């Protein structure tokens with residue numbers, strides 16, 4: 103199974119994925135680039151890109167969900183989920199680093215692919231796209247850095263509160279408790295105890311696979 107450190111590392115690297123306002127390409131530009139971007143379709147379970155391999159280029163999700171995970175297929179830990187509009191591959195390429203997690207289609211999915219040659223050509227010939235990419239990279243890694251900074255030295259319950267608030271999409275968190283624990287350098291039983299307490303105080307609801315935030319203001323106060 104992947105070590106806690108491998109899971110922690112992959113999960114925080116996966117928090118630098120481009121999304122919404124932070125995405126490196128404007129939607130208008132993704133459209134204009136149709137003859138450069140390759141359309142790639144994935145059945146559920148199919149690999150988009152492998153861990154420990156150099157990025158073949160930049161991936162953009164057009165529809166479906168891509169799971170990001172570490173560990174062998176059997177002992178898999180999911181560290182993040184890419185939604186439509188999300189972009190990955192570009193920061194590792196800029197760091198000259200291999201991917202540290204595997205992306206697998208969760209649902210049927212379609213991804214646009216910008217190969218590394220096309221990427222280099224694009225930045226070299228379209229200064230406006232390059233300039234936006236620069237602000238995007240800065241925004242994405244700085245946002246991750248700010249989340250980490252804010253949790254240092256804080257008691258574990260406050261860290262879990264903050265992590266939940268930051269992870270939430272439409273007030274829902276669908277990550278495993280083992281992964282949440284690894285992100286905080288903690289053990290699953292510790293996270294579970296804190297989640298039970300938050301549940302008793304009516305801050306969250308913990309279903310089978312999902313945590314829902316039921317009182318955001320109350321949870322913010324626990325984050326300190």
Ligand SMILES: [Cl-]
Nearest residue numbers: 171175204206
């Ligand atoms: Cl996998």
